[PDB]
């Protein structure tokens, strides 16, 4: 196929011989999938709103004979649009419908029902939706929830050996963690007794809680233990033989088995004497009496003669007790094994130490342990034991609870009961007794097989379920109040719990947050993030050791490279490109199947548990056409390591080498060359790059960003593409082809481009058309580019000329040196859009009118402001100028009746003293974008917003009127087509309407049917179009919901052009980011043999120093790319024919060995790529894969083909002195980065400013005041320099002393130079606070 | 929150003076408004304060001239926010530069520790007499050079100064120019004209010498020495008396900082101070003229790497074969394999170096003799501008092995150079251990800060009032003499300390009771009659002063010249700030600073200098086998030379069997006893 319509403009040259069979997924499918499964209707009852409604429902009061059955729910359409709602700045949520049905049962009468209750839907809460890009719209914010990672529910096997306990031995423990409710754990102590800890409470013995499970000691020893066999007939003392049950013996006498001695007295206990009686078949044997006293009794045997309780179970036997038991006529005797080799004497110390032998006293004791304040009344002990242990509501084992419970339980069926089971917890106690016995394997805490990610679906299901229970309580009170309630689900269900749970959840949460938007990159990699923060998964606020480490399970799913290099490290992760989430929350990664010796084309997704046992080959390997591997021993991995394995030991394949990296670090080329640390730093620096004016696609790249830019939702794509009709910067429309269309409604697809708009990062966003007109568009083609995007290809930075050189010491360490040429080329210039809102109103003194006067200010600002309205759009605001005038009532009336009706108050009318004006803060100057102000209902006499309220009506009327003309024009042309042969007239119909008078009469049928029809759908489309136009205009003029604490809201957008700056900062793809020392003239830049001064000058010492390899191959390969583009550009300077250049272009594509499917000239050869030569005339789009990237052989081969010297070094002359520098010099072209670190934003100079009423210290930075801060380190720095002055007057004169500032500024006059030492007022805040303290100190 | 702050970001001015500020025009006149109002007042260009405010708000061009009149001698003090030691705040003389940033002296940047990665900057304005003039007579960057932590003057002429002076001073066989008869001004005509390379071997140009041995007068001299043209260029930097290309040139390495120290040893004011930056001007000047570069051809991959990796892989294959047979345990097999990959990595490093010097050749005439290597990697490694043999070992040779979670060396080594494609799992373990390194280096800052909190909280108590109270108590000064080689000489410890008695040599004469110990007297007693390494010297800890400390008893030194005065914090803040850089970063895995469990005397007792090894505080016990054992528990084993000075002395524990107890001799690296 290789159609490549949308990529025909720029075909990025790809390298490497490793094909990708599985294409890059939409990659947002975790949030999109979680959302589409969060709102769904299914009969199976999948997790979501249906699972919550089925969980709580039916809602029945206690002894009320009334139930509430769920009709489930259906979602409606929101009141606003996506982009329009974001512009309005109101939360975006759809109402919920399909209320639950009620029921009524007759009291004292079984099955009696008065009537069935089916009620109409009731409004409950508001359910927000998600944009196609994965965001959430609340109050005009981005509101994305970070993915969560924590422990998956199931039986845990933990080591938990304390290093601070000093014991030096491992203490095993196991804890079952349900999805909700209390936690149940077991705890060892050196006494070797199983203990139980529930919700941090003190650990009780196993015998008291298991006794609370109503199991007698006979069932304890007979259940958890084997009673073996003991038989006594006339004191024959015959017992069964268990030669394979123990290794050992102690023999003080001979023991004969079936007429032959198995082990002689004093004979060896070795396996020679063991297997003799073991391999042979032996039956019960008779041995003397002395062997009973050593054994421990198992079952409970009492004397048959009298009724005493002697010889109770779990007790030691005495020599004199044998005579009392054996002579009592007991039928059989059960004795405990109790020999420690592979086992241990568990539960014994629990039975002995446990005070409560019965379930009742056990429930009373666990109740007293649960509640310290109230003594147990024994009445509620059963409900506390059941609801605390095994119950439907308080368990919530969910899916992974029973899945992992049966997996570790070694069960068969996956589905199980959602509550605790006695045999299940007994199995946990038995297998845990095996863990204490030494057999079995523990589980790793950091192993992701025990971890499951949680998303918006499960989290919003949890909070929404909690709110639904909060509703179930009050509704239970309402149904329990009355005996019979007709039409109950009306006023009984309140929306405040739902709207508070979902609106408080998505509104305020640790995971839910707005994003800082720099390029689509930071938006998508900020959209996909793994967080151990929030509920669960957070061990401590700081430090930690094994939690922050990297497990082998971090290979193919989470990216170890991308990471929060700041205070918390190793917590936030990034999923793989091909990673996916399983049904239980587990993470699966692709592996290609291999059958016999050939590699089949099917790929299966495997989690950590499944891929742990299987062996998978290394990412890079040799492949043959027959499917077999070239090398016999192929590098493969099984568990926690990798080694060469045979061709028969490889189960699966890794496909691409990019599975271990993420979208953030995957766009950094030559990863295998560059060091992982500096690649981590660069990947951390990729997200802060601000978009610039002109986006130039990176000439060195990957080819993943092609899918990232289109899959990021930032660019404007096209649905059902076709022949483009009209284009514009505001709007783009396309005529859809007739290949695939809907039969109804006809019409064409229209698009509204977003203009310059403020982001959360105060950046500039917009989309620009990539097509001219009349160009065919396919499905999925990007029409317009977002910020920092060029032709659907992501470029967040700008290339520029590069030379490696020390220059006159102006480049030191990481310092950067920028030419004035790029300064003159407008490159790196960006727009910063800050928003200014003046909103007050709300006064009991009367309303506040906007503008119309500026009190106590001359006409200077009145020239900028309109008489009845605000300032002109796109004006110059400098300093403290008033952008939007606002007044206040203030004193209003007074004596001299409001100054004689505002006579002495001049023309304000308020009276005087209105401070409500906006008054733009100092230091911020720029041009305003648009004033959105506010829109309210029933508001009149507002000159502001009139132009935009009219502009919206003209816009919707324009673009809707286009479709109206397409419809009415189409049907009118259909009339002109049907009137043929029925009395047609070209000269008449081509100069008049009606169509000869509604197709005349013709043959009767066409008259009434065709004419009456034409009028029917004509007036139907006209009247319907006008009705929908009025319905839309009503939505335009109705406005939104304003905050009740204000009458009118005013908000304005302003923009500033900020370009390359001397201090600034710059960053590389490989992690070098530094400040610019000085911007040098063009004349001072060294030039080549052609006299081309160099744009940038960096420090080559940082390559060995900071271990940055990829900069050499970056600059050199870039010099090759711009060598191709430079030679082709020279061909355009010579005006060569297409074919002569076409040969060099084709050679440029296919040079090297394979490593691409692209073929030049394939399609017509005279267009497309032919014009793409004029597209790439500036530079060549060369791409390298992450680990598959280019090699120095092909790099020097291409660069040598570009006529450039193969060594990548050109003889250079000084731009200053003109003399030649000794030795060749490395030059090239690399991709650079402009950040938000510019020193207009970072640097603020301040002298004197506002202070605070607390201690008289100023607030701090960003207030245009304060001296920043010199902390205790600077206090000890002045004590270190030995200056008493600077420190003493430092802490005192500036803040704690007014006398120092007054006398200081007074001494500035004539320069007395003295500064008052003063008495610190902050020290008077210490003396003050101490005076508030009960010990008050006063000076003498 | 202080006052009067620009809060700028550092830029690097190479030019102007070591102490001066590329204060910008934008940061200017914002904080200088009071001086501008008073300036227009006293000068009289304005009328009233409000009129001057109008003149400033209108941004007139006349305000810039008087603004310059104020700025030139009105200093600005500078500090980085994470401040550690006393030199963090320094006073410079500002001059306007167009821009939004501040151009800062890079040699001072190393003193601030600040980096150009974009760390913020706090810029404060001093107030009038005490601040401006106190920072003028005290806190200036040239007025404070010596650091009261290491004690040596702290200057970092690294990076393109080390590389530039390395390329400046060096020789080459053949090339062009041969020898030259011109001597003093050969750089102008010879270098700037044609035909003379920046460096040429075998040049007969004479160099004039100056002798300062005369009292208050310099004695000139001249003679013909063989020196390269670049060395003749470097000689023009300092007109004063020097070794004249012997110690004053060398290879263009840290020995340039050594000759900077010897030049600063005499008259630490003066053209010793001023024009010493000409080393920097020529350093970045002719370093930029050199234009060193790094590329694919720069690095060299040894061909022995394949044979070493293959041989080590075969040996380890035999090891895992023996483990498959059951003859070798898993532990000894693991540690053994670790040993083979470690020694093999060392082999790849050594062959890497061999191909770093002798593989690089230059073709001239027959080309068989070749010449010294011009490779930039070798210039950085040998010169010392940046990089290290370990980092280069990762560039070409093996990268080493570490595991953050396990803490042990992994059994899957990295066989791929950076130029070669790395394996996916190799990048996995590398980013693992690198993330661990980021966690540790990020963790050490807070712990070091807290350590400075405790130490500085203790150090506040020093008044340092009385001068000399005449105390007789002083510490006996003896060298550390630990291990095979002595760690530090006793001359550095006894240098610059008051001496009660301190008789060098066998008690002949040496120092008197009331004599101060300077560098000349202490160096004379250290060089002449060095057989006595123990001298009693007064210390700060022992002072007869009731309140405060005695400066004469503590010592004489500071950031400024010697003979310190009272009222100084001295070791309080100087030591509290001295301990900050030590704990700021751990050494390797931090187990180095810990007990290594392996020592010289612990394994095999060795001697430093050839001499008689004796046991101090011990009872010699001869045995029947002929060996010698110590009867007591705690003993001493020292190596005494013919002069009597102690070379190497280690405590001899009980149970050590030695071949010769006493009466014999020992050479360098001799092992008397060996105990497991």
Short mmCIF file of N, CA, C and O in Angstrom, two decimals, chain A residues 7 51 123 237 273 283 313 350 359 392 400 468 510 567 588 614 640 759 813 865 917 974 1009 1050 1115 1117 1149 1170 1333:
data_model
loop_
_atom_site.label_atom_id
_atom_site.label_comp_id
_atom_site.label_asym_id
_atom_site.label_seq_id
_atom_site.Cartn_x
_atom_site.Cartn_y
_atom_site.Cartn_z
N UNK A 7 1.42 12.17 4.83
CA UNK A 7 2.86 12.28 5.03
C UNK A 7 3.61 12.57 3.74
O UNK A 7 4.85 12.64 3.76
N UNK A 51 -22.54 -1.45 38.62
CA UNK A 51 -22.06 -2.27 39.73
C UNK A 51 -22.36 -1.62 41.08
O UNK A 51 -22.59 -2.33 42.06
N UNK A 123 -33.45 13.92 38.97
CA UNK A 123 -32.11 14.47 38.81
C UNK A 123 -31.30 14.21 40.07
O UNK A 123 -31.69 14.63 41.17
N UNK A 237 -1.04 -51.64 73.19
CA UNK A 237 -0.35 -50.43 72.72
C UNK A 237 0.16 -50.60 71.29
O UNK A 237 1.35 -50.47 71.00
N UNK A 273 18.93 -48.38 57.89
CA UNK A 273 17.94 -48.97 58.78
C UNK A 273 16.54 -48.40 58.57
O UNK A 273 15.56 -49.02 58.99
N UNK A 283 2.65 -53.13 59.06
CA UNK A 283 1.37 -52.79 59.67
C UNK A 283 1.60 -52.34 61.11
O UNK A 283 2.74 -52.19 61.57
N UNK A 313 -7.51 -32.51 75.83
CA UNK A 313 -6.67 -32.40 74.65
C UNK A 313 -5.65 -31.28 74.81
O UNK A 313 -5.81 -30.36 75.61
N UNK A 350 -0.81 -20.67 71.44
CA UNK A 350 -2.05 -19.90 71.32
C UNK A 350 -3.15 -20.50 72.18
O UNK A 350 -3.90 -19.76 72.83
N UNK A 359 -16.42 -19.18 72.30
CA UNK A 359 -16.71 -18.17 71.30
C UNK A 359 -17.39 -16.94 71.90
O UNK A 359 -17.22 -15.83 71.39
N UNK A 392 -21.10 -9.24 53.84
CA UNK A 392 -21.19 -8.83 52.44
C UNK A 392 -20.72 -7.39 52.25
O UNK A 392 -20.03 -7.08 51.28
N UNK A 400 -10.07 -9.08 41.93
CA UNK A 400 -8.72 -9.51 42.26
C UNK A 400 -8.62 -10.08 43.67
O UNK A 400 -7.66 -10.79 43.98
N UNK A 468 -23.21 7.04 47.15
CA UNK A 468 -24.46 6.29 46.99
C UNK A 468 -24.87 5.63 48.31
O UNK A 468 -26.07 5.52 48.60
N UNK A 510 -5.72 14.51 45.24
CA UNK A 510 -4.28 14.50 45.06
C UNK A 510 -3.90 14.07 43.65
O UNK A 510 -2.94 14.59 43.07
N UNK A 567 12.33 16.03 44.51
CA UNK A 567 12.43 15.46 45.86
C UNK A 567 12.04 13.99 45.98
O UNK A 567 12.75 13.21 46.62
N UNK A 588 0.17 -5.61 31.08
CA UNK A 588 0.68 -6.57 30.12
C UNK A 588 1.42 -5.85 29.00
O UNK A 588 1.05 -4.74 28.60
N UNK A 614 8.06 -17.89 31.31
CA UNK A 614 8.46 -18.02 29.92
C UNK A 614 9.80 -17.34 29.66
O UNK A 614 10.20 -16.41 30.36
N UNK A 640 14.74 -12.86 36.19
CA UNK A 640 15.70 -12.03 36.89
C UNK A 640 17.12 -12.03 36.35
O UNK A 640 18.04 -11.56 37.04
N UNK A 759 -3.13 29.18 27.92
CA UNK A 759 -3.02 27.86 28.52
C UNK A 759 -2.75 28.01 30.02
O UNK A 759 -2.64 29.12 30.55
N UNK A 813 32.03 25.95 31.49
CA UNK A 813 31.15 24.88 31.93
C UNK A 813 30.02 24.67 30.93
O UNK A 813 30.26 24.34 29.77
N UNK A 865 -9.88 53.97 27.75
CA UNK A 865 -11.18 53.35 27.99
C UNK A 865 -12.25 54.01 27.13
O UNK A 865 -12.19 55.20 26.81
N UNK A 917 -11.24 49.63 40.56
CA UNK A 917 -10.65 49.58 39.24
C UNK A 917 -9.56 48.51 39.17
O UNK A 917 -8.94 48.15 40.17
N UNK A 974 -32.34 19.57 -7.13
CA UNK A 974 -33.16 18.39 -7.37
C UNK A 974 -34.48 18.75 -8.03
O UNK A 974 -34.99 17.98 -8.85
N UNK A 1009 -47.62 16.01 -6.10
CA UNK A 1009 -46.60 15.29 -5.35
C UNK A 1009 -45.28 16.04 -5.36
O UNK A 1009 -44.68 16.28 -4.30
N UNK A 1050 -15.56 39.98 35.24
CA UNK A 1050 -14.78 40.55 34.15
C UNK A 1050 -13.45 39.80 34.07
O UNK A 1050 -12.73 39.70 35.07
N UNK A 1115 25.23 16.43 16.06
CA UNK A 1115 25.68 17.56 15.26
C UNK A 1115 26.19 17.12 13.90
O UNK A 1115 25.90 17.76 12.89
N UNK A 1117 25.54 14.19 12.13
CA UNK A 1117 24.45 13.70 11.29
C UNK A 1117 23.54 14.84 10.85
O UNK A 1117 23.03 14.84 9.72
N UNK A 1149 17.06 8.82 -0.55
CA UNK A 1149 16.14 7.96 0.18
C UNK A 1149 16.72 6.56 0.37
O UNK A 1149 16.78 6.06 1.50
N UNK A 1170 7.75 15.30 -5.42
CA UNK A 1170 8.40 16.33 -6.23
C UNK A 1170 8.28 17.70 -5.58
O UNK A 1170 9.25 18.46 -5.52
N UNK A 1333 2.05 34.24 76.64
CA UNK A 1333 2.34 33.10 77.48
C UNK A 1333 2.22 33.48 78.95
O UNK A 1333 2.41 34.64 79.34
#
